[PDB]
Amino acid sequence: KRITTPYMTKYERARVLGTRALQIAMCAPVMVELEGETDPLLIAMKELKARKIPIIIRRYLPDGSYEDWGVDELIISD
Amino acid sequence: DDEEETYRLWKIRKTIMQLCHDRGYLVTQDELDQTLEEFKAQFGDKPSEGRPRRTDLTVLVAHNDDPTDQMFVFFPEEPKVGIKTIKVYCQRMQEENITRALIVVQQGMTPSAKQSLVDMAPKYILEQFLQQELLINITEHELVPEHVVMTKEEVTELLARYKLRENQLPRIQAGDPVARYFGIKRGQVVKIIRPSETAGRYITYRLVQ
Amino acid sequence: PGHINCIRTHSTHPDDEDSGPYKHISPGDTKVVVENGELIMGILCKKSL
Amino acid sequence: EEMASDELKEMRKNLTKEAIREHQMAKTGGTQTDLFTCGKCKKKNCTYTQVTTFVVCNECGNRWKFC
Amino acid sequence: FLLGQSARDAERAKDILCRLEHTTLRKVTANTAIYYDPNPQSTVVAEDQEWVNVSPWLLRVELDRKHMTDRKLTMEQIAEKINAGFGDDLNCIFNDDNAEKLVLRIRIMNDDDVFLRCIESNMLTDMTLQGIEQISKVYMHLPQTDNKKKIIITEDGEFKALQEWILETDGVSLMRVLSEKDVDPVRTTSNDIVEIFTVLGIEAVRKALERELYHVISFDGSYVNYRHLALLCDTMTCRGHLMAITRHGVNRQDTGPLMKCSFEETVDVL
Amino acid sequence: SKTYQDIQNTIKKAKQDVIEVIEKAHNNELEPTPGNTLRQTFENQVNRILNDARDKTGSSAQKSLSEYNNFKSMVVSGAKGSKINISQVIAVVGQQNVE
Amino acid sequence: EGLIDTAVKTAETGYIQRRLIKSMESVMVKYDATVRNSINQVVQLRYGEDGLAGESVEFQNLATLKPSNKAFEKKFRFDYTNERALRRTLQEDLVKDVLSNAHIQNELEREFERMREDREVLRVIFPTGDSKVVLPCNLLRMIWNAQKIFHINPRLPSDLHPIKVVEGVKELSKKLVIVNGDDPLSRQAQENATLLFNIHLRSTLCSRRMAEEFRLSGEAFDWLLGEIESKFNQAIAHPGEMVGALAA
Amino acid sequence: RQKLLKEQEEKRLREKEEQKKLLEQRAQYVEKTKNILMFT
Known part of the structure; x- marks a missing residue:
């Protein structure tokens, strides 16, 4: 019964990319094959293109309720 | 005279x-x-x-x-x-x-x-x-939009739809000439319909308080 | 880049030119016309760039 | 006013006409031309002013500028 | 904006302007001289007006002709107003509209020397012969642009903008102006924010403020997207009353003590 | 070297016109324009005459330029400048209004 | 004089901007697709009364606003009696279908009636006849791009039945949603918000104009619908955007 | 053509509805003028 938009806003995309890059920088397992690159931020961007980020976004509503939206479920803007 | x-x-x-x-x-x-x-x-x-x-x-x-x-x-x-x-x-x-x-x-x-x-x-x-x-008659003036006094049932339906408390709606004092014209009192929502140049029609609500 | 399509007017574009003949062929090289991302007519200025 | 003499009535009419004229406001100046088509009324009558050339519609009154 | 046939012809619009413009004695009076004429029939001055009609003093308040004709007044209404305003205590002997001099004679019937001075001063400063207060003078200019020309859908379909006479005052009354006949009570705005809130309503104030903002921001040829203007107008008309953007309107909202101190009045709000 | 002749003729015509307006105002012929006093309408007429003269001079200067001119090229490009700048540089500066 | 004006402006505009920024600092678009402030007080049910970002909006024109009654009839009616015009515009396998079948005629009449209703609405909302309006998707540009890509060559009879256009426009009017919810108030708000854009879409996409000035084919029209829906979806206002600071 | 005819008679029904409202309002006015009279 989720009513928020099915598209990923730019703010959420930026924050997810940053958090995932920070996690890879701290020696975390990747969810995608590396083609010969090392920078964590590009790794996160490739990951977002591949829709394999193990993060789910909790959009809080003004009333107080919330909805858990998964990166691999909603459509990516860029 | x-x-x-x-x-x-x-x-x-x-x-x-x-x-x-x-x-x-x-x-x-x-x-x-x-x-x-x-x-x-x-x-x-x-x-x-x-x-x-x-x-x-x-x-x-x-x-x-x-x-x-x-x-x-x-x-x-x-x-x-x-x-x-x-x-x-x-x-x-x-x-x-x-x-x-x-x-x-x-x-x-x-x-x-x-x-x-x-x-x-x-x-x-x-x-x-x-x-x-x-x-x-102010209601016929160009600036004044078309007001509609709402009933309690539809006010409650509106409040339940957006999950928004009636206190959070905009305010309008009873001293407003439109408010006295329609006779609305405290604790009552009034529908507003203004011609929207960017969306055609835009309906908002205001609670008297 | 790409296949862009847009129409713009030049700064020194005489107004008495669209109404009369030579609308699609301007003696003064005005009436910027771009098709498939290729400049065809007109002189680029601030009105287009 | 009706019972006044012919000379007095004429003087009062002239004074009223002068006051009515003086109460008016001077029209905005400009070069009137029919070379510009106003998009707000579709008419050709309008007045221009060079300063950028401001366009003022004559009948419709469409206001625009050309650079 | 004129409503009746006066919108087309200026002859029936000048009277509308005159009635909407504040006229007092000072605007129509030219000279005012007091005389201690003992016997009302004596008439120290040579004027053949008193004995036909019939206190040891009178005021000879002669009026101008050009101004009186410009505002289109008559001595009858002037005498009626000057007699009713001060009660049945004086006796103004007006003059016929045939003589060259528009002389008058104000006498009192029932310290007394300065009473005439005081009454002449307080009537000359303000009497409101024909018009409303606040409004000082009114203009008459034809609309040259579409922002003020009348628009009516023609039977053929085209709009065909019409050129009609419109007024431009210098005060704020609105309320007493809309009630006047031959005045469109639908398109006559006020150009003031606080005034409309006591006449039309908060929504009308929002619309007028939006229009004024758009007019003052688009005068230099610049363009601002309407969404920002609407967002400002709603924020300033959200609590019913016109909250001021200054420290006296935003700190009154129940936002929070930590937000009020940031803008201004730190120690006070804390 | 002909545009200079046209500009000088236009300036002389404007001077003659404003002198005639001043003479009419002195001898009490210029009637007050509606909505304004005598001084106000006199000033408005003088300003309108001067602005018309300046616009005529600027138009004459612009129409006398060559395609190789750099001021005109840079104005029509709109990169930096305007027609009024060319008018002030060549034809005539104009009125120095204050307040 | 100019220098003094510049100095006093540089002194005053800063204070004006500071007061403007400090009054609408906490205003934002929550995930409920509504504009509120720090006190959760609703200021606008939809951002800008429509719920669209200010970046993806362009100036456009309303073709059905300020025609004449006679010209409006001969530009948006799609006369189905002159078979010669239909043969010139549509192909032979469509003229017989649009003539014999009466359901198509009734549907086209209903479309024209809706167009007249939209024109009356536009006239009663936009007085003074202002064709220049701002809308998300520039439909003329999209149509031109479709023509230049699919090589429409507007001289030959196109293969695009009017019923295809009608059903496509109806489905697109359903797909573009702002106020989600089947609730009658929700549907009413959705119709009110996305009103001008739908009117413009109907005015540009007709049975007559599509077969006289655009001549788009079925594939071209489908690509056009897809592009329009994608661009409108991208034009939606992103929740969590600080619109108060932007306006200030 | 028949659909046009039925629409026209539906408008006629709407007009008769106006007639009944006018008659009802007059039939209450005949009573209300009494109160308007006794008030003064």
């Missing part, structure tokens, strides 16, 4: 009829947009100590769905109306089961009268309108 006074009385009567029709009270299509010729032919067109004197042109109108609910429209002659006049009006009003009314005062009521008006509010609702404010 004689002719100007008649014109002012006719305009006030037209505005009162339009207000009653807007609120929901059933009125003739004839008297709703009656010209001034039949006004002259009806009363006598001699307001200066003649037939068309105040308190005789008063009208009582009942609501559409509730024929048992009416409202008087008085016209006291005293320029600085006191407490005795409103007292006798209320005393004569008590015979009938009517509760609402509307007072048309020449000039601003004395502050001592407003206390008595608000005192009898829970038992007999009555408000005032200066004649200078009734010479024009």
